[PDB]
Amino acid sequence: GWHLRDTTQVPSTMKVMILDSGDPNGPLSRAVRNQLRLNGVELLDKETTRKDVPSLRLGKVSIAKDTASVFRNGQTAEYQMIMTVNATVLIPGRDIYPISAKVFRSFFDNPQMALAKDNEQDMIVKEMYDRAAEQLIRKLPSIRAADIA
Amino acid sequence: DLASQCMLGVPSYDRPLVQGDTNDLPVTINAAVFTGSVDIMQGNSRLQADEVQLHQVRTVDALGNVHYDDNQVILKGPKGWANLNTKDTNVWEGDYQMVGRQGRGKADLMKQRGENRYTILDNGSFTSCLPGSDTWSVVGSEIIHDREEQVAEIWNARFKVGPVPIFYSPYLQLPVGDKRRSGFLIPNAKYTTTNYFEFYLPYYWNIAPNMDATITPHYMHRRGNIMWENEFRYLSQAGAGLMELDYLPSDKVYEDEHPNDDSSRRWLFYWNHSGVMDQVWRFNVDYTKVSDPSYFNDFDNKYGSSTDGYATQKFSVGYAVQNFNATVSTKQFQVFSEQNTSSYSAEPQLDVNYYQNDVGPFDTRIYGQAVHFVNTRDDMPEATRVHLEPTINLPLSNNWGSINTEAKLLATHYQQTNLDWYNSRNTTKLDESVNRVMPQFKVDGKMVFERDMEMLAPGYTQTLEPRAQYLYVPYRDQSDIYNYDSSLLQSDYSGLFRDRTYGGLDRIASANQVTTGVTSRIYDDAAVERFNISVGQIYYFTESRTGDDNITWENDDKTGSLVWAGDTYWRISERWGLRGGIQYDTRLDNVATSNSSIEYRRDEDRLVQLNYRYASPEYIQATLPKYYSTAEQYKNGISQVGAVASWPIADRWSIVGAYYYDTNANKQADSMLGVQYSSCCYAIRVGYERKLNGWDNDKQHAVYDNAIGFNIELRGLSSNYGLGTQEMLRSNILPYQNTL
Amino acid sequence: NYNNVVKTPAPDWLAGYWQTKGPQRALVSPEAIGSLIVTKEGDTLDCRQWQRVIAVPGKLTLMSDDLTNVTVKRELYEVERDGNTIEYDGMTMERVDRPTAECAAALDKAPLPTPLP
């Protein structure tokens, strides 16, 4: 006994959202903007003379790369990369609400074709944003539940 | 806790605090001559004495067990003196204490001249330990405590640890507070196995409010020559750099192991800049240059370790308004391993873009590139490249579905030159003018279901989202195009849905695939996901033939369900975790990769971990270069098992550990063990290591290195009040990561 | 959470005025005392003094068949009796009529909700 989804991915209260960040042209502020536009919410930027709309302020983005395995002579075999994002919803009237995200990826290494192994890292850090910008949207229904209590 | 335990040694001002000038404040006298427990209340300054005589130039003479209590100073002594004009007081031999922060001392003749906070002693001594504990002292003759900045001054200094002196050089200053002062620092030690000793001696500088300098000599007893290690830092309108330079005059072991050379020298150059000027321009530099291709095996740095294969050298410059881009980058490399040196490099690139997003119901996007490859040996081909990429979307949506029909049109025009050696030697011949035009087509989809779990958990909801895809890229022969920047990609569950098999733009494979996959998810009552499982396959209708299929699998099948994947993520509680992953391939007849993990994190000091990794030998045989399949060092794959731990003991100790087995051929790849004390006046730190290094050629036996660190610090006249655990848990070759 | 902790009344022997007598081998060295003020209803007050006085309140509660004290900062201290002595971290007390003046004044500054024996 199953039924199709009847609610909306983004709750019915935050359908007019204000985005704010420190780098309005970076990669994350493009990924999140496109992802939000996909779900139907209209984004009125450039904070104006309206006070009825929840906001969303992004935060610190960090990427770390380090060894994860070694061959039988000391060299490196696999690298591992991590991203961490932080954001705070700011529902008007009440207090702020923090959310987070985290992604994991890995890839092998090749010292003989290094240049080709530098155009594979770029694709990885370009497509990791599309998941770090989806976890945040998936965490949105939790905020409304903590707002109705 | 140690902080709260030590906090009950510093008295505090409980009386009401008054802010402003104290010269006009009222006077209270309790007892011209007053005899017997005379009390004075003048603002924050309070004085007590058996006898107080006021003589008015207002002079007050207090005699007999004279006390004192200011906002940040407490005095004691039999004889006292006072004056209200300059707020100056004189107190004879006694003891003094610092209130509001730690600090203790005694003297022979004190002084409290009201100008600023300069106090004077005559035979004093300034320590930083709580009363009743004699561990160390900074004994001098005249000491002036300045409190406008955070600076202290000492004359004829003689550092004493217990009842013994260990120092001289009279004019040295102890900086008490949290303001930067230009001075020396504390040394270290080591007993590594490559050089029999080690010694440092830093030096600090504070040129400007945003500037630094960290000149640091270094001893290398085995060699015999001091290796100077400069530094730099800054902060400006564009990011923050970390310039560095490590010179070394000459060596002896390098002159003995590697003879017949002009001179033996060493150097380095690090630079890491990353900032965003204004709101549009972007900048980036990642330079790293070394002298000899054995530096990292020798003396170690905090910017690169033994596990390394090359050294990146990249630039960047950027423009991005809201729907536009540009870039002029430059990537060059340097290969350490002196076996085969033919690495390529990229001269100025270019990346344009465009993002118009409202044409009818469709979308729009453009790309571009212009690169000029050059090789590092006079006879390998060099060429050029131009690219274009018009695309169009058509996104639909609903409450339970989606469709993402797509299109594209690729193009490229090389121009290769310097083709003599390669054409003469090998069979297939390269030409001087090629072109490539190939369309594309892709259809997507999605769905979502839901339920209210009646089973064990009441109020939990379960979802189940299927998926699908398609692909079509025609076949064009690509045997006349040298492989410059193409590599074979991996395929996890997330990478299953993709339109590219090779990275870069040099080789593009054909495709007729039909992907699939499902995903489930168990939500909590307050919409908190705590479960993700995933499966997914691929059905090749026709194999991918790029024109140069130089891959050697075991069974060579073309069509059929070939690839598989998996995933999991459990979130048992707030102090646990679990991850995973697995791949497969019917062309290898063996699992190709596998992960695992588990964690427990009560705080920043207690944690345990376990993990597993895998890579079948057929993977290293069908993906890595050809000499990785016959040597005894690489052919067997990776099957390592690890474990991490940390747990405070009592309330001052901390214990760390690590291990990394290798079950394919029983060995050991790491070991760390560092204890750490934390008292109320000093600290202690030890270390260890058993890292792998090098591969002896004679009898195929690896080489290990040991290490024993050592540290010490002066703690108590500062703000740092935490045990050093994270700073020590990130020192081995395979650092620790957070998998919670 | 401290608020979610359910107060459990202490037994008759636990109620009283506990004052350590002598060095405690856990508070620096020269001369320090760590005192406990606990009513009959399970409300706690931690009293320490060497050169300065710092006091933290808390409530008594049961856990794993053991009476455990929880302070404001979520510290799990368990009580165990040895004769006429209650025991938690690095401290042992006898029964005393009255506390020190400093901690009495501190209590007067921050009274407990329950009546004080």
Side-chain angles (χ1 to χ4, degrees), chain A residues 3 5 25 30 66 68 70 72 74 78 104 112 118 138, chain B residues 279 307 321-322 333 399 450 529 613 625 636 638 640 737-738:
Chain A
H3 58 71
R5 217 181 33 190
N25 322 313
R30 190 127 51 212
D66 39 40
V70 287
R72 209 136 66 247
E78 316 191 291
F104 272 84
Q112 232 173 355
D118 214 315
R138 195 137 30 96
Chain B
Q279 241 182 2
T307 60
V321 189
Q322 202 146 269
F333 296 96
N399 242 346
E450 258 194 2
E529 141 196 348
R613 286 227 158 219
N636 272 126
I638 294 311
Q640 96 177 358
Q737 302 263 247
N738 228 38

PDB file of all heavy atoms in Angstrom, chain A residues 3 5 25 30 66 68 70 72 74 78 104 112 118 138, chain B residues 279 307 321-322 333 399 450 529 613 625 636 638 640 737-738:
ATOM      1  N   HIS A   3       1.302   5.396  -1.825  1.00  0.00           N
ATOM      2  CA  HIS A   3       0.658   6.514  -2.497  1.00  0.00           C
ATOM      3  C   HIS A   3       1.716   7.525  -2.912  1.00  0.00           C
ATOM      4  O   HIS A   3       2.763   7.648  -2.273  1.00  0.00           O
ATOM      5  CB  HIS A   3      -0.407   7.175  -1.608  1.00  0.00           C
ATOM      6  CG  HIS A   3       0.116   7.678  -0.297  1.00  0.00           C
ATOM      7  ND1 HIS A   3       0.943   8.775  -0.194  1.00  0.00           N
ATOM      8  CD2 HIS A   3      -0.087   7.241   0.967  1.00  0.00           C
ATOM      9  CE1 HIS A   3       1.234   8.988   1.077  1.00  0.00           C
ATOM     10  NE2 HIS A   3       0.622   8.071   1.802  1.00  0.00           N
ATOM     11  N   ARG A   5       3.518  11.190  -3.691  1.00  0.00           N
ATOM     12  CA  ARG A   5       3.699  12.368  -2.855  1.00  0.00           C
ATOM     13  C   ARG A   5       2.591  13.380  -3.111  1.00  0.00           C
ATOM     14  O   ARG A   5       2.282  13.704  -4.261  1.00  0.00           O
ATOM     15  CB  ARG A   5       5.063  13.000  -3.124  1.00  0.00           C
ATOM     16  CG  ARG A   5       5.739  13.568  -1.891  1.00  0.00           C
ATOM     17  CD  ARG A   5       7.079  14.188  -2.239  1.00  0.00           C
ATOM     18  NE  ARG A   5       7.070  14.780  -3.570  1.00  0.00           N
ATOM     19  CZ  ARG A   5       8.150  15.215  -4.203  1.00  0.00           C
ATOM     20  NH1 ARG A   5       9.351  15.132  -3.657  1.00  0.00           N
ATOM     21  NH2 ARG A   5       8.021  15.745  -5.416  1.00  0.00           N
ATOM     22  N   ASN A  25      28.285  35.567  -6.962  1.00  0.00           N
ATOM     23  CA  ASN A  25      28.580  35.074  -8.301  1.00  0.00           C
ATOM     24  C   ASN A  25      29.384  33.780  -8.296  1.00  0.00           C
ATOM     25  O   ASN A  25      29.709  33.269  -9.373  1.00  0.00           O
ATOM     26  CB  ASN A  25      29.327  36.139  -9.110  1.00  0.00           C
ATOM     27  CG  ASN A  25      28.828  37.537  -8.829  1.00  0.00           C
ATOM     28  OD1 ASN A  25      27.624  37.784  -8.806  1.00  0.00           O
ATOM     29  ND2 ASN A  25      29.754  38.463  -8.620  1.00  0.00           N
ATOM     30  N   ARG A  30      25.431  29.831  -7.545  1.00  0.00           N
ATOM     31  CA  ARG A  30      24.769  29.442  -8.782  1.00  0.00           C
ATOM     32  C   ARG A  30      24.043  28.112  -8.634  1.00  0.00           C
ATOM     33  O   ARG A  30      22.900  27.973  -9.088  1.00  0.00           O
ATOM     34  CB  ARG A  30      25.781  29.354  -9.925  1.00  0.00           C
ATOM     35  CG  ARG A  30      25.153  29.186 -11.295  1.00  0.00           C
ATOM     36  CD  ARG A  30      25.663  30.235 -12.267  1.00  0.00           C
ATOM     37  NE  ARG A  30      27.120  30.307 -12.274  1.00  0.00           N
ATOM     38  CZ  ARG A  30      27.817  31.414 -12.491  1.00  0.00           C
ATOM     39  NH1 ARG A  30      27.221  32.570 -12.729  1.00  0.00           N
ATOM     40  NH2 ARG A  30      29.145  31.359 -12.466  1.00  0.00           N
ATOM     41  N   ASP A  66      43.453  14.782   0.843  1.00  0.00           N
ATOM     42  CA  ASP A  66      44.547  14.116   1.537  1.00  0.00           C
ATOM     43  C   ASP A  66      44.578  12.644   1.144  1.00  0.00           C
ATOM     44  O   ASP A  66      43.640  12.119   0.543  1.00  0.00           O
ATOM     45  CB  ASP A  66      44.419  14.271   3.054  1.00  0.00           C
ATOM     46  CG  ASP A  66      42.987  14.175   3.526  1.00  0.00           C
ATOM     47  OD1 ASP A  66      42.241  13.331   2.993  1.00  0.00           O
ATOM     48  OD2 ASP A  66      42.608  14.947   4.429  1.00  0.00           O
ATOM     49  N   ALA A  68      44.599   8.550   1.280  1.00  0.00           N
ATOM     50  CA  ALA A  68      43.766   7.535   1.908  1.00  0.00           C
ATOM     51  C   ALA A  68      44.297   6.118   1.755  1.00  0.00           C
ATOM     52  O   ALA A  68      43.813   5.224   2.457  1.00  0.00           O
ATOM     53  CB  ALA A  68      42.338   7.589   1.349  1.00  0.00           C
ATOM     54  N   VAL A  70      48.059   3.667   0.351  1.00  0.00           N
ATOM     55  CA  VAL A  70      49.451   3.678  -0.079  1.00  0.00           C
ATOM     56  C   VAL A  70      49.809   2.326  -0.675  1.00  0.00           C
ATOM     57  O   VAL A  70      49.334   1.280  -0.224  1.00  0.00           O
ATOM     58  CB  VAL A  70      50.409   4.022   1.080  1.00  0.00           C
ATOM     59  CG1 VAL A  70      50.316   5.491   1.428  1.00  0.00           C
ATOM     60  CG2 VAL A  70      50.097   3.167   2.290  1.00  0.00           C
ATOM     61  N   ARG A  72      52.911  -0.522  -1.824  1.00  0.00           N
ATOM     62  CA  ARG A  72      53.908  -1.195  -1.001  1.00  0.00           C
ATOM     63  C   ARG A  72      55.301  -0.593  -1.155  1.00  0.00           C
ATOM     64  O   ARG A  72      56.302  -1.292  -0.953  1.00  0.00           O
ATOM     65  CB  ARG A  72      53.927  -2.694  -1.309  1.00  0.00           C
ATOM     66  CG  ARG A  72      54.352  -3.555  -0.125  1.00  0.00           C
ATOM     67  CD  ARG A  72      53.467  -4.777   0.044  1.00  0.00           C
ATOM     68  NE  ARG A  72      53.586  -5.713  -1.067  1.00  0.00           N
ATOM     69  CZ  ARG A  72      52.616  -5.972  -1.933  1.00  0.00           C
ATOM     70  NH1 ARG A  72      51.442  -5.366  -1.858  1.00  0.00           N
ATOM     71  NH2 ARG A  72      52.827  -6.864  -2.896  1.00  0.00           N
ATOM     72  N   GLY A  74      55.456   3.239  -0.462  1.00  0.00           N
ATOM     73  CA  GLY A  74      55.316   4.530   0.179  1.00  0.00           C
ATOM     74  C   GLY A  74      54.469   5.522  -0.594  1.00  0.00           C
ATOM     75  O   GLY A  74      53.894   6.431   0.013  1.00  0.00           O
ATOM     76  N   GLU A  78      45.070   6.440  -3.536  1.00  0.00           N
ATOM     77  CA  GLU A  78      43.767   7.080  -3.648  1.00  0.00           C
ATOM     78  C   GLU A  78      43.737   8.358  -2.828  1.00  0.00           C
ATOM     79  O   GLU A  78      44.233   8.393  -1.699  1.00  0.00           O
ATOM     80  CB  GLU A  78      42.643   6.159  -3.170  1.00  0.00           C
ATOM     81  CG  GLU A  78      42.737   4.722  -3.641  1.00  0.00           C
ATOM     82  CD  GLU A  78      41.466   3.943  -3.357  1.00  0.00           C
ATOM     83  OE1 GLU A  78      41.183   3.675  -2.172  1.00  0.00           O
ATOM     84  OE2 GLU A  78      40.746   3.598  -4.315  1.00  0.00           O
ATOM     85  N   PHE A 104      31.346  13.275   0.208  1.00  0.00           N
ATOM     86  CA  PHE A 104      32.565  12.475   0.171  1.00  0.00           C
ATOM     87  C   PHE A 104      32.788  11.955  -1.241  1.00  0.00           C
ATOM     88  O   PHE A 104      31.852  11.455  -1.871  1.00  0.00           O
ATOM     89  CB  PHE A 104      32.480  11.296   1.143  1.00  0.00           C
ATOM     90  CG  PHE A 104      32.941  11.614   2.532  1.00  0.00           C
ATOM     91  CD1 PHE A 104      32.083  12.198   3.445  1.00  0.00           C
ATOM     92  CD2 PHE A 104      34.229  11.314   2.933  1.00  0.00           C
ATOM     93  CE1 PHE A 104      32.506  12.486   4.723  1.00  0.00           C
ATOM     94  CE2 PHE A 104      34.655  11.599   4.210  1.00  0.00           C
ATOM     95  CZ  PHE A 104      33.793  12.186   5.105  1.00  0.00           C
ATOM     96  N   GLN A 112      52.174   9.672 -14.106  1.00  0.00           N
ATOM     97  CA  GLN A 112      52.702   9.739 -15.462  1.00  0.00           C
ATOM     98  C   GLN A 112      51.872  10.615 -16.388  1.00  0.00           C
ATOM     99  O   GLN A 112      52.386  11.065 -17.418  1.00  0.00           O
ATOM    100  CB  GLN A 112      52.798   8.327 -16.057  1.00  0.00           C
ATOM    101  CG  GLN A 112      54.155   7.967 -16.624  1.00  0.00           C
ATOM    102  CD  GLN A 112      54.242   6.514 -17.040  1.00  0.00           C
ATOM    103  OE1 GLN A 112      53.313   5.738 -16.825  1.00  0.00           O
ATOM    104  NE2 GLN A 112      55.365   6.138 -17.639  1.00  0.00           N
ATOM    105  N   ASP A 118      44.530  16.504 -13.589  1.00  0.00           N
ATOM    106  CA  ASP A 118      44.122  17.789 -13.048  1.00  0.00           C
ATOM    107  C   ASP A 118      42.832  18.302 -13.669  1.00  0.00           C
ATOM    108  O   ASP A 118      42.232  19.234 -13.126  1.00  0.00           O
ATOM    109  CB  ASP A 118      45.231  18.830 -13.247  1.00  0.00           C
ATOM    110  CG  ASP A 118      45.305  19.826 -12.108  1.00  0.00           C
ATOM    111  OD1 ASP A 118      44.247  20.329 -11.680  1.00  0.00           O
ATOM    112  OD2 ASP A 118      46.426  20.105 -11.636  1.00  0.00           O
ATOM    113  N   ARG A 138      17.010  19.524   0.871  1.00  0.00           N
ATOM    114  CA  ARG A 138      16.333  18.389   1.488  1.00  0.00           C
ATOM    115  C   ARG A 138      16.150  18.565   2.990  1.00  0.00           C
ATOM    116  O   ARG A 138      15.246  17.953   3.566  1.00  0.00           O
ATOM    117  CB  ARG A 138      17.097  17.096   1.202  1.00  0.00           C
ATOM    118  CG  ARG A 138      16.296  15.837   1.478  1.00  0.00           C
ATOM    119  CD  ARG A 138      16.490  14.812   0.383  1.00  0.00           C
ATOM    120  NE  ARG A 138      17.801  14.911  -0.244  1.00  0.00           N
ATOM    121  CZ  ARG A 138      18.848  14.172   0.097  1.00  0.00           C
ATOM    122  NH1 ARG A 138      18.778  13.283   1.073  1.00  0.00           N
ATOM    123  NH2 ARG A 138      19.994  14.329  -0.560  1.00  0.00           N
TER     124      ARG A 138
ATOM    125  N   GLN B 279      33.734  42.393  -6.196  1.00  0.00           N
ATOM    126  CA  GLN B 279      32.707  41.364  -6.243  1.00  0.00           C
ATOM    127  C   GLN B 279      32.716  40.559  -7.533  1.00  0.00           C
ATOM    128  O   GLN B 279      31.867  39.676  -7.689  1.00  0.00           O
ATOM    129  CB  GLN B 279      31.317  41.985  -6.044  1.00  0.00           C
ATOM    130  CG  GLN B 279      30.583  41.473  -4.824  1.00  0.00           C
ATOM    131  CD  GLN B 279      29.199  42.071  -4.688  1.00  0.00           C
ATOM    132  OE1 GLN B 279      28.761  42.848  -5.536  1.00  0.00           O
ATOM    133  NE2 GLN B 279      28.500  41.709  -3.620  1.00  0.00           N
ATOM    134  N   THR B 307      54.354  10.875   0.576  1.00  0.00           N
ATOM    135  CA  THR B 307      53.367  10.418  -0.392  1.00  0.00           C
ATOM    136  C   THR B 307      53.086  11.507  -1.417  1.00  0.00           C
ATOM    137  O   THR B 307      52.158  12.303  -1.240  1.00  0.00           O
ATOM    138  CB  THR B 307      52.073  10.012   0.314  1.00  0.00           C
ATOM    139  OG1 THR B 307      51.540  11.141   1.015  1.00  0.00           O
ATOM    140  CG2 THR B 307      52.342   8.906   1.311  1.00  0.00           C
ATOM    141  N   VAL B 321      30.177  37.905 -13.804  1.00  0.00           N
ATOM    142  CA  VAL B 321      29.231  38.935 -13.394  1.00  0.00           C
ATOM    143  C   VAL B 321      27.989  38.294 -12.793  1.00  0.00           C
ATOM    144  O   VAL B 321      27.807  38.301 -11.571  1.00  0.00           O
ATOM    145  CB  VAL B 321      28.847  39.828 -14.586  1.00  0.00           C
ATOM    146  CG1 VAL B 321      28.053  41.028 -14.116  1.00  0.00           C
ATOM    147  CG2 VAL B 321      30.084  40.258 -15.349  1.00  0.00           C
ATOM    148  N   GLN B 322      27.129  37.732 -13.640  1.00  0.00           N
ATOM    149  CA  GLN B 322      26.125  36.763 -13.210  1.00  0.00           C
ATOM    150  C   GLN B 322      25.856  35.666 -14.228  1.00  0.00           C
ATOM    151  O   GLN B 322      25.461  34.566 -13.832  1.00  0.00           O
ATOM    152  CB  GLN B 322      24.804  37.464 -12.875  1.00  0.00           C
ATOM    153  CG  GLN B 322      23.905  36.662 -11.955  1.00  0.00           C
ATOM    154  CD  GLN B 322      23.100  37.536 -11.020  1.00  0.00           C
ATOM    155  OE1 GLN B 322      23.534  37.840  -9.909  1.00  0.00           O
ATOM    156  NE2 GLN B 322      21.918  37.946 -11.463  1.00  0.00           N
ATOM    157  N   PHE B 333      53.803  21.186 -14.672  1.00  0.00           N
ATOM    158  CA  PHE B 333      54.062  20.182 -13.654  1.00  0.00           C
ATOM    159  C   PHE B 333      55.530  19.788 -13.671  1.00  0.00           C
ATOM    160  O   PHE B 333      56.274  20.098 -14.605  1.00  0.00           O
ATOM    161  CB  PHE B 333      53.178  18.949 -13.850  1.00  0.00           C
ATOM    162  CG  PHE B 333      51.715  19.227 -13.694  1.00  0.00           C
ATOM    163  CD1 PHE B 333      50.925  19.471 -14.800  1.00  0.00           C
ATOM    164  CD2 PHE B 333      51.130  19.245 -12.445  1.00  0.00           C
ATOM    165  CE1 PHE B 333      49.579  19.727 -14.661  1.00  0.00           C
ATOM    166  CE2 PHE B 333      49.785  19.501 -12.302  1.00  0.00           C
ATOM    167  CZ  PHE B 333      49.010  19.743 -13.411  1.00  0.00           C
ATOM    168  N   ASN B 399       4.484  17.456  -9.150  1.00  0.00           N
ATOM    169  CA  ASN B 399       4.679  17.154  -7.740  1.00  0.00           C
ATOM    170  C   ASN B 399       5.390  15.826  -7.515  1.00  0.00           C
ATOM    171  O   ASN B 399       5.870  15.582  -6.402  1.00  0.00           O
ATOM    172  CB  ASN B 399       3.334  17.150  -7.013  1.00  0.00           C
ATOM    173  CG  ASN B 399       3.256  18.202  -5.930  1.00  0.00           C
ATOM    174  OD1 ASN B 399       4.269  18.778  -5.535  1.00  0.00           O
ATOM    175  ND2 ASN B 399       2.050  18.464  -5.444  1.00  0.00           N
ATOM    176  N   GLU B 450       5.624   7.196  -1.208  1.00  0.00           N
ATOM    177  CA  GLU B 450       5.647   7.448   0.226  1.00  0.00           C
ATOM    178  C   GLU B 450       4.764   6.441   0.948  1.00  0.00           C
ATOM    179  O   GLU B 450       3.880   5.819   0.354  1.00  0.00           O
ATOM    180  CB  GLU B 450       5.189   8.873   0.549  1.00  0.00           C
ATOM    181  CG  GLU B 450       6.320   9.826   0.871  1.00  0.00           C
ATOM    182  CD  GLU B 450       5.830  11.113   1.496  1.00  0.00           C
ATOM    183  OE1 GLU B 450       4.607  11.243   1.710  1.00  0.00           O
ATOM    184  OE2 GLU B 450       6.669  11.996   1.777  1.00  0.00           O
ATOM    185  N   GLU B 529      16.210  12.640   8.007  1.00  0.00           N
ATOM    186  CA  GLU B 529      16.576  11.425   7.293  1.00  0.00           C
ATOM    187  C   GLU B 529      17.716  10.705   8.004  1.00  0.00           C
ATOM    188  O   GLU B 529      18.670  11.332   8.471  1.00  0.00           O
ATOM    189  CB  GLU B 529      16.974  11.762   5.856  1.00  0.00           C
ATOM    190  CG  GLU B 529      18.151  10.969   5.320  1.00  0.00           C
ATOM    191  CD  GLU B 529      18.746  11.586   4.071  1.00  0.00           C
ATOM    192  OE1 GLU B 529      18.113  12.493   3.496  1.00  0.00           O
ATOM    193  OE2 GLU B 529      19.850  11.165   3.666  1.00  0.00           O
ATOM    194  N   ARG B 613      39.379  -0.839   2.894  1.00  0.00           N
ATOM    195  CA  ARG B 613      39.515  -0.413   1.509  1.00  0.00           C
ATOM    196  C   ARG B 613      39.871  -1.619   0.653  1.00  0.00           C
ATOM    197  O   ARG B 613      40.354  -2.635   1.155  1.00  0.00           O
ATOM    198  CB  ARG B 613      40.577   0.682   1.360  1.00  0.00           C
ATOM    199  CG  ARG B 613      40.138   2.038   1.876  1.00  0.00           C
ATOM    200  CD  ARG B 613      40.458   3.135   0.882  1.00  0.00           C
ATOM    201  NE  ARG B 613      39.638   4.321   1.091  1.00  0.00           N
ATOM    202  CZ  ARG B 613      39.125   5.055   0.114  1.00  0.00           C
ATOM    203  NH1 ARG B 613      39.333   4.756  -1.157  1.00  0.00           N
ATOM    204  NH2 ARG B 613      38.386   6.117   0.419  1.00  0.00           N
ATOM    205  N   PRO B 625      49.139   2.507 -15.739  1.00  0.00           N
ATOM    206  CA  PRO B 625      50.116   2.242 -16.807  1.00  0.00           C
ATOM    207  C   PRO B 625      50.665   0.824 -16.817  1.00  0.00           C
ATOM    208  O   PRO B 625      50.450   0.051 -15.879  1.00  0.00           O
ATOM    209  CB  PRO B 625      51.225   3.259 -16.514  1.00  0.00           C
ATOM    210  CG  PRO B 625      50.516   4.389 -15.887  1.00  0.00           C
ATOM    211  CD  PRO B 625      49.436   3.772 -15.042  1.00  0.00           C
ATOM    212  N   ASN B 636      49.627  -6.107  -6.561  1.00  0.00           N
ATOM    213  CA  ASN B 636      48.743  -6.832  -5.655  1.00  0.00           C
ATOM    214  C   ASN B 636      47.549  -6.019  -5.163  1.00  0.00           C
ATOM    215  O   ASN B 636      46.699  -6.572  -4.459  1.00  0.00           O
ATOM    216  CB  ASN B 636      49.536  -7.348  -4.453  1.00  0.00           C
ATOM    217  CG  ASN B 636      50.143  -8.709  -4.704  1.00  0.00           C
ATOM    218  OD1 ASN B 636      51.347  -8.903  -4.545  1.00  0.00           O
ATOM    219  ND2 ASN B 636      49.311  -9.660  -5.106  1.00  0.00           N
ATOM    220  N   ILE B 638      45.264  -2.961  -3.178  1.00  0.00           N
ATOM    221  CA  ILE B 638      45.157  -2.347  -1.858  1.00  0.00           C
ATOM    222  C   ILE B 638      44.105  -3.101  -1.057  1.00  0.00           C
ATOM    223  O   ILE B 638      42.968  -3.254  -1.515  1.00  0.00           O
ATOM    224  CB  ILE B 638      44.788  -0.857  -1.965  1.00  0.00           C
ATOM    225  CG1 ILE B 638      45.918  -0.079  -2.630  1.00  0.00           C
ATOM    226  CG2 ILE B 638      44.499  -0.281  -0.599  1.00  0.00           C
ATOM    227  CD1 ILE B 638      47.268  -0.371  -2.042  1.00  0.00           C
ATOM    228  N   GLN B 640      43.930  -2.616   2.735  1.00  0.00           N
ATOM    229  CA  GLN B 640      44.378  -2.178   4.050  1.00  0.00           C
ATOM    230  C   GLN B 640      43.225  -2.095   5.052  1.00  0.00           C
ATOM    231  O   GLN B 640      42.054  -1.971   4.690  1.00  0.00           O
ATOM    232  CB  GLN B 640      45.079  -0.825   3.944  1.00  0.00           C
ATOM    233  CG  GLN B 640      44.194   0.362   4.234  1.00  0.00           C
ATOM    234  CD  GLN B 640      44.961   1.659   4.194  1.00  0.00           C
ATOM    235  OE1 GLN B 640      46.172   1.667   3.988  1.00  0.00           O
ATOM    236  NE2 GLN B 640      44.261   2.767   4.393  1.00  0.00           N
ATOM    237  N   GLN B 737      40.304  11.863   9.218  1.00  0.00           N
ATOM    238  CA  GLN B 737      39.174  12.615   8.697  1.00  0.00           C
ATOM    239  C   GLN B 737      37.926  12.292   9.508  1.00  0.00           C
ATOM    240  O   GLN B 737      37.853  11.277  10.202  1.00  0.00           O
ATOM    241  CB  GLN B 737      38.939  12.307   7.214  1.00  0.00           C
ATOM    242  CG  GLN B 737      40.127  12.603   6.322  1.00  0.00           C
ATOM    243  CD  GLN B 737      40.025  13.958   5.652  1.00  0.00           C
ATOM    244  OE1 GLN B 737      39.886  14.051   4.434  1.00  0.00           O
ATOM    245  NE2 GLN B 737      40.095  15.018   6.447  1.00  0.00           N
ATOM    246  N   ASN B 738      36.933  13.169   9.406  1.00  0.00           N
ATOM    247  CA  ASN B 738      35.679  13.032  10.136  1.00  0.00           C
ATOM    248  C   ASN B 738      34.654  12.365   9.231  1.00  0.00           C
ATOM    249  O   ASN B 738      34.290  12.918   8.188  1.00  0.00           O
ATOM    250  CB  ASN B 738      35.173  14.394  10.609  1.00  0.00           C
ATOM    251  CG  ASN B 738      34.764  14.387  12.066  1.00  0.00           C
ATOM    252  OD1 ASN B 738      35.406  13.751  12.899  1.00  0.00           O
ATOM    253  ND2 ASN B 738      33.688  15.098  12.383  1.00  0.00           N
TER     254      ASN B 738
END
